[PDB]
Structure formats: C-alpha cells, structure tokens
Amino acid sequence: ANVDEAILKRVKGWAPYVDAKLGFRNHWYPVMFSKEINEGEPKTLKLLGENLLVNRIDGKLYCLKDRCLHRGVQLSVKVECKTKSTITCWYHAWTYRWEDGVLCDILTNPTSAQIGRQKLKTYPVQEAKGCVFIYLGDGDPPPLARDTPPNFLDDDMEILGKNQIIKSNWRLAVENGFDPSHIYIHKDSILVKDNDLALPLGFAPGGDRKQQTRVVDDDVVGRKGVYDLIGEHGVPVFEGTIGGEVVREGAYGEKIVANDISIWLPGVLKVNPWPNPDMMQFEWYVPIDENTHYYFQTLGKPCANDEERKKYEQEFESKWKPMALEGFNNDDIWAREAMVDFYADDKGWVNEILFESDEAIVAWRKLASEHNQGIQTQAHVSGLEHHH
Amino acid sequence: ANVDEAILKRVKGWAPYVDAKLGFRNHWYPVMFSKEINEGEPKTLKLLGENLLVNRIDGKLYCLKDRCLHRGVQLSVKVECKTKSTITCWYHAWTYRWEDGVLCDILTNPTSAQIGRQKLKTYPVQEAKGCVFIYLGDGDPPPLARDTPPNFLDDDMEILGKNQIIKSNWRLAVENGFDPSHIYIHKDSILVKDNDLALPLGFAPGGDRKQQTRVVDDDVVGRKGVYDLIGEHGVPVFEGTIGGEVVREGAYGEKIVANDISIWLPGVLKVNPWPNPDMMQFEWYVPIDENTHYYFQTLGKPCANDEERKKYEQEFESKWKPMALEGFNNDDIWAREAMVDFYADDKGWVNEILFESDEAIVAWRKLASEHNQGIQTQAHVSGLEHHH
Amino acid sequence: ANVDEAILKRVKGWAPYVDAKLGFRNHWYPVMFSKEINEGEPKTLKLLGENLLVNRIDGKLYCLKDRCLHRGVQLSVKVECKTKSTITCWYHAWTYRWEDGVLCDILTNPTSAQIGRQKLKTYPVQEAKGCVFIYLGDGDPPPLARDTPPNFLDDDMEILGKNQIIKSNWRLAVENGFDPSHIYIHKDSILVKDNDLALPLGFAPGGDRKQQTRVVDDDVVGRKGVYDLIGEHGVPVFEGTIGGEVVREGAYGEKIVANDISIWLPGVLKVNPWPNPDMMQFEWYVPIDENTHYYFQTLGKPCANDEERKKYEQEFESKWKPMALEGFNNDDIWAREAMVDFYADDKGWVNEILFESDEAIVAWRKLASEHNQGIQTQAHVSGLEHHH
Amino acid sequence: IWLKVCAASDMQPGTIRRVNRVGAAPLAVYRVGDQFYATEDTCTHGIASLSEGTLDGDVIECPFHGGAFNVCTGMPASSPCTVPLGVFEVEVKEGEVYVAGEK
Amino acid sequence: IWLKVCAASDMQPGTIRRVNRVGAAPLAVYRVGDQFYATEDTCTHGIASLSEGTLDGDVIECPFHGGAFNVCTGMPASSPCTVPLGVFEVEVKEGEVYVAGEKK
Amino acid sequence: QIWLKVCAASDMQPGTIRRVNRVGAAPLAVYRVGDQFYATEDTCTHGIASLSEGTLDGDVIECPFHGGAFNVCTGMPASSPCTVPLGVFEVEVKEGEVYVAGEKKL
C-alpha cells in the first residue's frame, strides 16, 4: 500500500519489492561505525523513515525512538540525560529508561497515572566488526548473520570502511550494485589502471536463464540472496563495437577480481575478490526514507595478528579507501541518482525495457519479494492504525 | 473540510478545532502596531491565508483584499493610488474605493459595464491600544471586546508590544502557551533568576477534573475562554526526581506571578501578573497560513498619567521587552516548532498521549470547537464554491 | 486529463484549452537559434515536459528523446558519441542512431536480442530564419508555415531575436501578449518616449462582439489564429480618469505602430508594425513544463542584401534588443508572473471576472480549443498507457 | 412601458432568446415549459451571454464559468456568480410575450 | 469489596455508567445485552473518560481519539490504544449490580 | 526444419500456452484459443519475459513482467507498455499433430 494498486497489479513477478519503497522491516541494518558513538553521547539518525537515538552506556549500545510519547517532539532537540540510565524529554520532562523504554518518571508531575504504564519504542542494537547494526523490527531479533553476507563475520576478517548519505531510493542502489552490465561506467576508473585490474566492458550471456544466477534459500544461517553467474558461460566483452568498428576496449590488466558477486537481503552486496585479489568488499544500501539511503561501504581482509592488521589500515587509508571506495564507487553514486526520475513516479517499474544481463536483477527482485521479513509503511512511521 | 474525514471522525471531542488548520473566520485579529502604518502608505500582509492591503486615509485605516477581481493579481505588485480615496490595479487599471471596495472606474475602458457592478472584498479594521485589529469575517462585526481578554481594553491600561512571524501552525502556539506543565522549558530562564520569580517545574494535580479549569461561556461582551486552575488545589513541584534521587530544582523566587492564566477565542492568552507583580501579558497567535502565525506579544500596565506611561515605555524597552518578551518567551518559539512534524500529517491529533495537566488543553479544544464563529477553508481563500 | 474534471466541466467554451496545461502536441515549436547549436555539440532542452537532446551532424539537426530506453536515465548526464552518427548511453552502452533512434548496438552485450528491435523516440527538427523548430508530435509533420505567423517566412524578412526561460505557464504569456488592454502596463516604457510612439492607455470598444476580432481558419497554409480588431470601432483612451478627473494620459507620439495584432496556434503573437513602422515582432510562448515557458522573441525587417542585413543587425544589438525586446517587454514578464498564483490551482479559470476587451482572449481560447492538434498529457511524458 | 418580444410559439420549450435594446443592455427571455421569464442577458460575473448558456429547469447556467442563476428570482444558484441578476416580469397575453421595461 | 452501582433495570442494553469512587479513580460499567462489565473509566491512551464514549457490542470507543477496548477482556480493539484496560469483576445480586472496586 | 512438431492437438487444453524451444534460435510460444492454434515468439518484445509464463485471455496474451499484452493471432500489441509487434509463426495440424513454422510470417 505504498504504491498505486494499478502498478502493483502489473508487476506480478515482484509486487512486494516494488511496494517496499520505505524498505523491509524486521531486518538488521548498519547505520554507523562503533568509533562514531561515544559513551554518554547520544546520536541521532533516521532509519526506514523513523527518527532514532543511539546511546552508549557502560560500553553497551541502546536505541530509543527519537519521539516523545506525549506531544511527539524529538527528544534530541534538547538532550537531557539526567541519570546514567535515563533520558528526560526537554518539554514536559517525561523520563524514559534506555534499556526498556519504560516511562519511569515525569518531573512535571511525579503523581501522574502515566508513569510506569507507557513505553517508548526501543530497537535491538548490536556491534560487530566495528559496525553498529540496528534491528528495525519487532520482537526478539534473529541472529545478525541472517542479514549479513557470507564471511563478513569471520573471526580473522578485519573490517574497515566509510558511510555517507546518498540521494536515491535504496532499491536503485541495490540494483546498480548487482547489475552485471553496469561495469561499463567504471571503464575509466583510476583503480582499473593504477591497480592493473582485468575489467571487461560487459558480457555476452551463455546458457539457459536458470544458469545465469544461483538463488540461495537453503543457507543454514537463514541468509537469502542471489549469486551473479553471468561469467560462468558468458563471453566477456573486451572490444566494444559500433557498426562492426571497435570504438572501445576493456581493461587488459593482470589482476583477476570480482569473479564472485552476490546480493543479500535486506540489501547488501558482496564482491569477491575486490578491490584486490586478497580482499573483499561488503556494501549496504540502507533505507533512510523513500528518497535517501546510507551507502555503507566496508572492505575486508583476513588478518591473523595485531600487525598487518595495522598495515592493512595504513593501506586502507592510503590506497583502498581513496582509490576504490571513492575513486571507483563514486561513479555508482551519480548512476543511482540518474535513475531517480524514471522511478520517482513508480512508473519506471513498468516502462523499463530490460535486456539479458538484467536476469540477475529480476532474480533479486523475486527473492526480495518472497523472502523479505516485512514491508515498512508510513503507518509504521506515524503510528500503526487498525480496527480489530 | 481541511482534514482527512477519517481523522475528524476519530476526534469527536473537538473535530471543528482539528479541522480549523487555517484558523477561525469571523473574529478580530491583531496584525501590526498602529505606528507601523502611516498616512497614504499601503501595507501588505497575509491573514487566515488571505492576502490583504491596509492603508491609512485621513488618519483612518481601511483594508481591501490584495487580489484584483479581474485576473487575480496582487495589486501590491505595483501600487498605484492615483487619488486619495482609491487604488488602481497596475495591470488594466481597474480602480477601487478603499471605503467600500467598489469598482468605481476602469482607466483602460471608461465605458465598461463592470464599473459600479463589482466589489472587491473589504474587512473591518480597528485600532485599539496602539494595535491594529482586522475582522477577518463577513457581515457586521461584533464588538472588539468580544475577541480580547478581560482588561486589555481598560481605559488606563498602557499597552506596549512586539510582533513577528513564527513557523508553526497557530494551534501549536496556543496549546504551548496555555500548557500548565510547559513551564519546565523555562526553568533556566534569565528572567526568573534576575527578576527573582517563583517558578515550579510543574504541578501535582489536586481535586477533581472539573476543578482543574474554569470555562467562561459568556461575558457581558460575549467572550469565550478557559482559566487554568491547576494551582488551586495542585501541589507545586520544585524538586525534580528520577528513581527517587533529586536531579533538578525549580526556582525559589519571592515574587509570585502568573496566578491568573486564561486562553480566549480566537486564540489569545492572558497571564496575570507577568512578568512583574504590576503588569500583565496578553499574546495572540494569529493564523497567517497553515504553517505560520504572528506571535503578537503585548505587556500592559495601568498608568494614570503621561509620567507613568513615559516611565513604563522606558522600562519596557530597557528591561521587559528584552528580558521577558524575548528572553523568556524565546524558548516557547522553538518548543512550538518542535511539535510541527508530529501534527503536520494531522496524525498527531490522534496519536498524542496526554497526561493530567493536559486537562487545560482539552478544555480549550472543546471550548474552541463549540464557540468559534466559523472555520476558514481554502475555498474562502480562492473563492467560495457551490454547484446547484 | 491534466485538470480536475469538475473544473473542465465548468469551462464548456474552452475546456481543451484549460486542460492543455502542458501545451498542444503535434505542432512545431522554436526552442533556440541556429547559432546556438554547433557541429557535434549535443544540447539538452525540455519541451512540453519532455527532455530532449539536439545535435548537429554534417550540418543537419537531429532530435532524440533524452531518456535511455533501458533504465530511463538521461543520456546527457554523460554524453558518449563514439561514432559520428550515434550516441552511446553511459550506463550500459545501448547505442542509438541520431537519424532514426534505432537501437543499433549495445557494447555491453553484442548478442542481445534487443539490438535492432527497439527505437528511441525522435522528433523532426527544422531550421528556418536562423531559428530551430522542433515538431513535438507523432507521424509525418505538416508544413512549418502552418505553425508560424504570416510573413515570418517571407524570403526577404530578416529575423533576429532573443530567447529565455520565464517562470509562468505558457497560456498566461499568450493571453497577456494578445490582451488589448494590458498596454496600460507599458505606459512608462522608455521605448514609447525614446521612439516617439503613439500609445493609448486602452480602448473603449465599439460595435458588436463579432467585430472585436477576426477568426482566421480560412488561411490556405492552414494556419489558425485571431486578429485583435478592437481599434476598428473603438475609441482609444488617451485621458485616464477617476471620478471624471484626469489622472493619467497616454503617449501622443507621431509613429503609428501595432496596427495589426494577431495570435496564432500553437502560441505565437505577431505585432505589426513594431517596434518601428518598418519592422514586425513575432514572439512565441513555448511550453517547457506546466510552470515555465520559453519567451522566444524575434524582430523581422525586410532586407534586400547582405549590406542591409548587417545594418539591421547592428541596430538590433544597439537599440531594438535593449530598448524594445528588453526595455518594453520586460514589463510583460513580471505581469505574467503576477497571474501565476490565481491560476496555479486551476481555479482562476473559473473565478476570473472578465471585461469587454477580454473578448479577444475568449476568441483565442475558443480557437485554440477547436483547432489545436492534440493535448499533451503527463502520460506522453512518462509513457503512454492502455489496457486491453 | 412593456416590450413586445415575440409569439409564444416562436420559442420551443427550454430555449433562450436574446432581446437587444438600442441604447440599453440586452435581455434574455427564457421559456421553461410553457412559462416565460426574463433577466439581463449579461452574466453578472463577466461578459458572457446567458442566452448562449444552458437552461436546466428554471436555472440558467452561464457558458463561461459554470456560474448559474434562478431565472425566476435572478438569485445566484451556482458559484462563482454572486451578484443577483436583474429580473423583468413577463406576461403572456393572447399568445404574445411581453417583457417589462424595468425590474 | 463490592460497590453498590445501580439496579440492573436502571441501565438499558448498550449503555455505559460511570462509577465515581471516593479517594480513587473512576470506573466504567457497561451493560452489553443482559450482562454487565466494568473497567477503569480513564482511557489508557490518555485522560479521556470512556463512559463518555460509544459502546458497540462489547467494544467501547474512546471519545478523544477513537481508540477502543473490549469491555470484557480490557484488551485494546482499535488504535491508537495499546495498553490493556484494568477490568473489575461485576456481580448482579437480586436486581442490583455491584462492582468489585478491586482490580481483577 | 520448415515445420516443427510441437505436440498432439489433444495434448493442449483450450486457453493454454506451450513453450517451444529451438536449437540455435529463440523459443516460440504456441497458444490454443478454442480449437484453433496460434504461435509467436515466446520472448516479450518489451523485455526478457517469457510469454508462455503469462496469462491468456481469449486471443490476448498478457506478459507476467509488466502487464503488457499482445494479440496472439496478429502479434500486435494489446496493452502498454508493449509497442513492438511479435513475430507470428503459422501453425498447422496434420494427423491431429500440431506443427509450428520454423520461419515467421512476412
């Protein structure tokens, strides 16, 4: 009910996905790095359209909805944490506990009947690999692994990265990321030349439809995703032609990368190896609201000891972060933005003219529609509405 | 007419008030001070969503709608007052009399059949206590006293004030002003400390609900309002506690002020005494459009002669204005702005969780719903519609 | 359907016109001057709500819709013309021929079944009198002469002009231009004084309605328009009066100009002679979107050779452009903008109170409603829709 | 004082006839069923001719903006019309329609 | 423990009766058909008096925001209400109704 | 081969669709409308969808991807967003056996 019913009736193959303009509820989402949230210093953020507050108390993170139950103001306008375990609204002093959101006191009226009877929404928060994950859902959360790509949580896998807000719906980011033929926009990337990478312009598909991908729905951890196998039978394009004349060539570098690409619910891509044969890239496209998303980038590299783990960081800052995460992925950013207009009115979901390599995207759309854990709605944002 | 019918259906206790997003028609509203408009110098303003023009001719004020009958342009784009008693539209020269809005001439066609056959909307304007009031309504206006708080018009009451545009719907301003527990936001006020005022953090209600307020359904002049009596049997709260430990304290000043607080239609608050034992504050929250209002503040003090009023004016400019009107009330301004989001989609009127001191607000909502003289609609702004 | 059906039902005399908020499809429209588009330099523009790309190849102009068939991005975000006769989308390399829009190649997949089976929308482009005209329509275009005022295409008529984007719907511009009484806004024009022009303040109409204009639908080239004949039986107003007393006079210059004023579909005005007895002014109000238009101004003056053309050019840049096109018409620009609010909600089309000289505008509204070649709809912009 | 307009049979039911008056504003004569009424012809909201409008029962709808008036009372029946129409009593005698010279 | 409310006959089916208690919060007594029920009078979502609301079957609708509760179970029936209402045991003894005046 | 053997006419129920895969060529879709048979390319001209996985309504097939549609007899578009006509292949029944042409109609 986020999109015109007429359009949903048309996209019979993935209507839930097209309706999920605000993202999927009941999944874990990374929103910041552990280093960005300090003890006793609450931070604000918007996730799936909801304003939230995250605080660190005795080293542990807590998440409360940033909206007072009384008159609906954001507590963050003027933060008043009067005791270690609570936060007091600046307006009429309704006070809530960070651990369970219970309204435990009201300074403007200590005798109010509301005390102890109301509860502000709280969301589970977990830190892993130096990343802050919030379970934007209801009830006890599933393990974080269900919503992370394979190997992200490996013991020796050292994770580093960056995050920023991008102006496009999260779905446009996901599809661009899993798009087999979009590598064409990266043909002039510095990382390509500078890191001597082998990078074609596209692929001439081979085999049947089913062979183009590997849909994963038998993962013991509960993971649900899709693998892009266009390269298994497809002939990579290194000489692009027009009228039979070669007008462009791919990158004939020596380093073999990105032979393993997969997208996983709620919306995280895994590219392996990348940006180097001994590394991996994991990136999330987190829904902030219908028009924006967090582009949460991470690069992983196994490290067995405190050293090298340090050399990795040094190289991350010196090469990987500026040359790959930025130098390479920056083109993905404006590419996402370029699709905004066509899909803004939801009509792009009907008028798009797909071609062979989009089989991977269609597979993702179907997987997401069938295995998402809930459709976030504006009602979830303002307050659920119902008549039993 | 202005809100989703499903929402109005839910708020049975005050549907008209919730619907009155643009304000109440057929009431007097202050919009500027007398000294802000000089002889033959037309001034523009927007009230209840309507663009208006006010001019002073031979000392008297006149108000015409700032929209030519012909092609709907604002006359004020290029003012042309070619004779003392008229204004000529800059486009095709349709000319109107300030006195009755009659189309008395058309320079581009002196033989037009429209001449003397059309009338531009006019609104009554009255000056009192140095304030300019406009009756944004139809037909003969009621006495100005009906729409003003008691004593504002007293012969000896010397009125001085300030006015500005605030970005919030007028109702959020009204409710914040009459909110008994909102004083919590003023706990760190410089006025309270410097003027040694007694100011609790809030009140623990005493007595029954009916005793919390006093509704005035009629006066010798027909005014409609509500008095906040939470302090009659309520216990002032000076110590703020959380989990039993003291985390805050109210102000233990000696000066007892604000023992008399009342809100009146169309939306004007009276606080007496304030900000000093010998003064009173009268403030209006005038609807400009759905998202903004004029915060028209005035401080009154009885003065018997020119000596007292001269001294008062000096005290006002050097102390009361900067310390009270600005220093104290500035916190009310951002408090109002903080409630905008929750009520912007009109859902806050359903999802708000009220507590005891809100009995005052509820009383106002009901009084306003039962005695307002009309609901301003977008149709009033563009032109009333009706199809036989 | 671009307007609330209730409103369209009310304006029975010209509903199609009121519905044509985006302009009339299947007409030629000038969008720039030939000197503004150079060989191999693609230029972007929006016409009738559609984003277009124009390019010059071997001297000839070609027009392609600036929206890739694949994922709906604008090709112009990053232009890639790899061969003289084609353009390659920067995203997945779908390549189209400028000549017919046929998808002739796809660099990311040379085996794609889409190759040669899709075609991007193209529109006829024609250069005449140094002006670039685009036929925003479907099928074989009619002769350009049909959509141009008489004499604009005369062999010796030398055309010079200026173009800019104005913030108002195209119809407000058309009506202001053909509005007989709007000349009142030009009473203080520097051009009038500095060129000794005779210019009344308005007109007292004479004769019956039919005589106020001449509806043209008998032109052999098929052009459809209306001539303003208010001055044939009307009395020019040179002494403007209020209450019978003269408050303003018109201009008593010696030069006789503006003897013939005519408006033509799709929306081009011809004033003759103007701004001098031996010149003519032809101006278009081209729909860009519902809120803006190109104000395409041109001045024509018969020239028999290169020597006269150069002389005229010099007088144009030094006098006519700054004094007439800018100094005189600049008042028309803000006049158009002043009507935006009244008509923005489409209600002005119902609430406007017209007077005698508006007979000219009504005639135009009726002609446009009856002879336009199609109503541009948002569906034309996003993609025509239809269910079996 | 009265003005002889036409024969009752000159008008079919539900039709309107414009009556020009030299040196004066035109009038509109309406035939509602077998009854006759008259008002000023010019819509009070603009320059439209009500005789070029649509008659629905005893309500005339202006062709320009959809405003309307009750031809019997001359009072506005639909917005944007707000100024009442001038009404002229009409009487039919011996199959002849006469319209008063004044309102 | 029981409080004298009124004679069962004083209440027509589908009506609500507020029961004010000395030094305590008010209660609401509902007559659904031929059976009586009771809960707190104050809506758990705010400060509204449910006795001034509308009874539809066994569901009481709050006059303030349209939230609702099942008068038998005290469980929320319509948004925005989410906090269960306190239910009090009712007893009809010899024509007259009584309320436990004690949370069940 | 000129005529490709598809199946027994009786093996198809009225209102059903059957996909015909071909070596070295794009798949075809055979439709049974009443007692008659028609055939077109299987791939929707608007994308990469398989029309045989769509919904047949009379002589109009609806694509499962975006709701576009085609008339199976003429191959002409019946519903947006489809705009490119489908290639149609003649179908004949010899000895109760359905045969579809290897080359589309001109």
Ligand code: FES
């Ligand atoms: S809005 Fe938070 S305590 Fe009132």
Ligand code: FES
């Ligand atoms: S818009 Fe004012 S006179 Fe024409």
Ligand code: FES
């Ligand atoms: S969006 Fe243009 S080739 Fe894909």
Ligand code: FES
């Ligand atoms: S001119 Fe008759 S309704 Fe406007």
Ligand code: FES
């Ligand atoms: S106070 Fe009862 S629904 Fe809000």
Ligand code: FES
């Ligand atoms: S792929 Fe068939 S309608 Fe789009």
Ligand SMILES: [Fe+2]
């Ligand atoms: Fe990319």
Ligand SMILES: [Fe+2]
């Ligand atoms: Fe305040």
Ligand SMILES: [Fe+2]
């Ligand atoms: Fe002009």
